[model samples]
Target: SENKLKQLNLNNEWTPDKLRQKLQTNAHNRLELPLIMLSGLPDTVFEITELQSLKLEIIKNVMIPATIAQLDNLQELCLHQCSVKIHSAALSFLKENLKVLSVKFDDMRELPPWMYGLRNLEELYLVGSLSKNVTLESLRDLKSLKILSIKSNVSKIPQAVVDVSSHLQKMCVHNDGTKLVMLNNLKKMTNLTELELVHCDLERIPHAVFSLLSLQELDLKENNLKSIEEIVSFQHLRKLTVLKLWYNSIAYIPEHIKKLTSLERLFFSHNKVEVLPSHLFLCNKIRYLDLSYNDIRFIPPEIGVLQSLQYFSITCNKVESLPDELYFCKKLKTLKIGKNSLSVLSPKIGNLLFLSYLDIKGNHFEVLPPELGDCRALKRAGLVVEDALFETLPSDVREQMKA
Candidate 1:
């Protein structure tokens, strides 16, 4: 009775010493706590025979190995961003009742072969810079898995990762250049709702990947794609809501992109796009649009027609003039026209009723537009005409920042 008496099915906190003493007695016969979290404990801590959920964070010099040994009834385990480097020692110590396991670290190079047989796992997350030591055959036995995130610097993703988890609803793989070629097997993830493939040298996605009609969100930024044709595979996406294709070689906006009525945000920055498609602003559901750090010579006048747009950015482009229709964007909140060739702000710019943050730094302005004073809703304004063709803000901008 020395321990805080938690009744049947009660979820309670148990410190290291308290848990050790509880496990030694028969008091746990009728008591079942579904959650157990241990932190800052050594690797030789005491173990418990029953726990449905276990969370261990920042337990570097703690006795976790001894505690994980006792968790025979564990169903869920999460160890986030730990400094642990010993993978085989950790996986070999996990209990069979574990259904969800998440381990994020810095130097995890290989997964133990025993991890392949974790068929009871429904979700697993692993993060580290890995080499080609693990293979798909290692995961061939995890048939009950549904979500897997292998964020590693590994060159190639094991085919077993793609071929084994047939019921996977979400999968995130951070690969080098090697794994981009073999995602053809992902078509089998019919229930996949979210897919993220980052830092992979993928030039283009084959159209067959869109056969996954259940996908709701797809992120493909920081890849090696060259044009809007890279999105040809997504036209058939019936349920997709968020699609990110930035950091590619996309220099032009294809007309077919406007067909996605469900798109909420389109981020296409740091590319070679020279002009915005006239109808690119037609996506009515898009609330955030970023076209920064590109060679955009001109934005279509029709861009102001997107009534649903609340955040619009055209920074770091070579554009010289702001479109007259931009004044019509009544819901505009953050307008980043700074670092461009802007010479003057249109008088109609004051008509943006919801405009809050305006940045005009690093431009060719020679004087401040008095009309900006009419924008009473603005809370933050950057730069002025005094700092023309320069990187630093002028005195008037400093005054604006001060006020």
Candidate 2:
């Protein structure tokens, strides 16, 4: 018998020869290289003219030489944790072709004058120290920018960014936790479709957010919020579909939650909730939900109302049992109820033809339903249960899994 033997290593040592080989066999449109101890961009990197995105991380004393212009296809640059120097020859190329720029600095660094001249730049992410004397109009020249993210120590949104409010559609700010970032100018950005405010230390929803009528996604995490009664104010943003209020101290979900007609995703984990609010079942469009690491005692049988749900999690809670109606969510793909007090699982679980992942360990159950094998998408690897109870499944299912 003749057998062919070949050895291949995947991304272990990134050298030009290896990348050149990969560039032919695989598409190399995105290149994420971490130059741990290296100083600057390697010349060979510029040879790949088809690169569309490049991320250089953990590199110090980095310099982008004029050869960078050779990659005309490159539009996105993620210069993370770097102290970089941009060559004069590359300035014109960067100003004319770059569309997205993400820069992260660990220490004091200047926002170069060239940053304001990127006429075609559409997205900019700045994460670092911005000197207090930074020009108020420093960002106004980016006329084409539509997304701006600032993860720095700022109490107020930079006024320079507001100059493009008419065109900007997404904005994210991560406060330094020394103070809550103020959004007094939110009403002026009427066109915003997505917004995030993390580590803001907010005890309640900001009074200014209620007026953003065009918002489709709103994220507010890592705050001191003790109550979500302020969520009633969300009724004003009718277009909102994704709501994130996790990493808070909220203990309640008021009936007003049902007013989110377009809501499709809810992230409410790591809270103090102890009971499922009846009105939560009425958000008919929700597909993703997370209520993990909380004090939730049970899931209401009304969960069947979420016909569009695809993901649900009640892990690390006190839930005792799941109602038969929960399996009525025919489209469910992932269910996480581990670390609970459940004793039995209803046979109706087999009704979920699309369920691919199930987390059911750390409970009191000693046996599993053989009907579980009826799930078409569930693979043995996706089922998180004890090996002892796993053998209890129908032999056909076990063989099918082994196959």
- lDDT string for model 1 (1-403, tens) is 5222321112234455555553321232332332233344433233455545555554442223434656566666556544433334456555355577766555442333355667777788786555544533457667788888877665544656666546788888776554465565676667788888776777776453586798888878778777666454576787778787777788878877788878877888778888787768777788888889999877778877787788888889999887888777788877888689977667687687677788777877766655565566674433233433222335564456458
| Candidate 2 TM-score, true structure as reference | 0.88
Q: Please list the residue runs of candidate 1 whose C-alpha ends up more than 4 Å from where it truly belongs after superposition.
A: 1-40, 43-124, 129-147, 153-159, 162-167, 371-377, 381-403
Cα-based lDDT at residue 23, candidate 1: 36
Candidate 2 lDDT, 1-403, residue by residue in tens: 1211110121234456754554421133454433444444566677777767777777766667899999878788777677777888897798889888887877655334467778789999888865433333556778898888888776666667668888889999886774555667777788899989888776789987887899999889888789788778888888899999988888888998998888999999988889878899899999999999999987998998899999999999999878888999999999988789999887888899999999998888878888887888888789888788788888898888656
CA lDDT, every prediction?
A: 0.65, 0.80
lDDT of the structure predicted as candidate 1: 0.65
